[PDB]
Structure formats: structure tokens, C-alpha cells
Amino acid sequence: MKIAGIDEAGRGPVIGPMVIAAVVVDENSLPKLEELKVRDSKKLTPKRREKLFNEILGVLDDYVILELPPDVIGSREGTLNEFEVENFAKALNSLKVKPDVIYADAADVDEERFARELGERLNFEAEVVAKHKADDIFPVVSAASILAKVTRDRAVEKLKEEYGEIGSGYPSDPRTRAFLENYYREHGEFPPIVRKGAGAIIGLAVGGVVIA
Numbered sequence: 334m335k336i337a338g339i340d341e342a343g344r345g346p347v348i349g350p351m352v353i354a355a356v357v358v359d360e361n362s363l364p365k366l367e368e369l370k371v372r373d374s375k376k377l378t379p380k381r382r383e384k385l386f387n388e389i390l391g392v393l394d395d396y397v398i399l400e401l402p403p404d405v406i407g408s409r410e411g412t413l414n415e416f417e418v419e420n421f422a423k424a425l426n427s428l429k430v431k432p433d434v435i436y437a438d439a440a441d442v443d444e445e446r447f448a449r450e451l452g453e454r455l456n457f458e459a460e461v462v463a464k465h466k467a468d469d470i471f472p473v474v475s476a477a478s479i480l481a482k483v484t485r486d487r488a489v490e491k492l493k494e495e496y497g498e499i500g501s502g503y504p505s506d507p508r509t510r511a512f513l514e515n516y517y518r519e520h521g522e523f524p525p526i527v528r529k530g531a532g533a534i535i536g537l538a539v540g541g542v543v544i545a
Contacts (some may be wrong), residue, residue, distance in 0.1 A: 334360030335394065337432030337459075338473030339421050342481035344440070345413045348502035348509065348526050349489045350400040354480035355424040357395040357432050358473055365392040366472035374479050379486055386483045389476045395430035396477075398484050399423060406523075407504065407532025407545055414440035418447065422454030436471045437463035438478065492526060504534055514538045 341353040358366065369388050377385065390396065401420065404413065417440050425435065435455075439447045444464045452461040467474040489502050496516070500509025516524050517538050523529055536544015 335430060335432040335434075336360060336363055336473050337425070337428070337435045338437075338467075338471060338475070338477035339425060339435060340438040340468060340474055340478040340481055341417075341420065342478065342485040343503070345408070345410060345504070346403045346485075346502045347406055347504050347513075348403060348499060349485060349492060351403060351420075352481040352485045352488075353399040353401070353420050353424045354477045354484070355397045355399075355421075355428055356389070356393050356473060356477045356480060357428060357430050358392060358476075359394050362392050362394065363472065366476050371472050371475040371479060372469055374475065382479060383483055385479055389479060393476070395428055396480065397424050397427045398480055399427065400484065400488075403502075403528060405528045405530035405532060406536075407534035408530065410504070410532060410534070414442065417442075418451050418454060421451055426454075426456050431457050432459055434460045434462070436467060436474045437461065438467035438474055439463045439465050441465060496524065496526070510536060510544070513544060517543050 335357055337355060337357045339355045343351065369385060371385060374382055374385050421437060437448065437451060448461040448463040451463065468478040493499055498508055499512045500506040502509060504510065513523065513527065514536065533545040536542060
């Protein structure tokens with residue numbers, strides 16, 4: 334009995350990687366995840382959550398951490414969760430050990446629809462059930478969400494090391510928006526860690542509007 338969890342740390346990042354994590358555990362090993370109180374990993378400190386990260390990779394039968402590029406500045410931010418299904422499928426279809434059941438985390442969309450569309454994107458037959466905030470409900474989804482989180486936080490902690498305070502890496506985050514302006518103001522262009530293309534979001538730099 335192979336159970337799988339899938340989730341992704343963050344939704345529409347502008348900086349850092351977009352991370353999708355899919356994990357697979359045998360039914361007999363599922364309990365171990367709850368014993369590790371994974372659903373209670375959010376309160377955990379980053380440094381303490383890496384503790385779980387490893388405790389988890391020990392109990393898992395398989396796993397896949399997909400690291401994708403960020404979204405373009407103001408990139409079709411309108412219901413940007415349109416890649417959710419595609420990205421999740423991608424990850425799940427990369428798994429060595431195919432699961433018999435998949436538990437996903439839905440993005441405020443029609444739960445029953447999400448699971449259906451997702452199931453059809455997989456290249457293997459399996460039962461799929463998803464729902465809002467699944468990480469609080471299912472441990473496997475919880476564990477999966479931890480792998481994504483750590484991976485995204487490490488990569489961003491790495492970026493700060495080179496670009497100083499950059500915020501969370503999202504367009505909604507103040508320190509990030511500010512960080513992106515100062516960089517421009519003092520380099521006449523956006524850093525190589527951001528991609529520009531289409532969209533329109535607030536972002537002014539002494540005169541004109543760079544961010545959009």
C-alpha cells in the first residue's frame with residue numbers, strides 16, 4: 334500500500350525557485366510521519382524543521398523535489414494556480430515508485446475537480462484526493478510540504494547571502510519590492526535572479542515605474 338503526498342512551498346514567487354515536492358511512503362510507515370508530528374512542523378524553527386526534513390527522508394519509500402524557475406514580474410498573477418495541476422503532475426510523474434493513492438493540496442479551487450484533472454495528467458492509474466490546506470490534514474502531504482519548504486528556504490537563505498535582505502522573494506513582500514528597487518536604482522537594471530516579461534504591478538524607482 335503506497336501512499337503519496339504532493340504540495341509546493343509558496344505560490345507565485347518572483348525570486349528563488351518554485352519548489353514542488355512529491356513523497357511516497359508505504360502504509361505501514363505512514364504512522365511514523367505522525368509520530369514525527371509533521372502536521373505540527375509550521376511552528377517549528379527553520380533550523381528545527383531541517384531536523385524533520387531528514388527524519389522524513391528516512392521513513393519515505395521515495396520522493397521527488399522539483400525545482401523550477403520563478404514567475405515573471407506580475408506574470409499572469411490572476412489565478413496563477415493554473416500551473417498547479419501541471420506542475421504537480423510533472424513531479425508525481427517523476428516518481429520511481431508509483432503510489433496507489435495520492436493526497437494533494439488544493440489551491441482554493443474545486444477540490445473534486447482538482448483531483449480529477451490532476452489524475453488525468455498523470456501517466457499512471459491511481460486514486461487522487463485533494464483539498465484546501467491538506468498539509469494540516471494528511472501527514473504525507475504534510476511531509477511533502479516540508480521538503481518543499483526547506484528547499485525553498487535554503488535557496489533563498491543562499492540568495493540573501495549574496496544580495497543581502499531580499500524579503501521572502503514574493504511580489505507581495507515589502508522588503509522584496511524595496512530590495513528590487515534599490516538594486517535597480519543602483520545598477521540601472523533588475524538583478525539576474527528576477528525575470529521580466531509581461532504583467533503590471535506597483536514598483537517605482539525615483540521617477541518612472543520599473544516593476545510591472
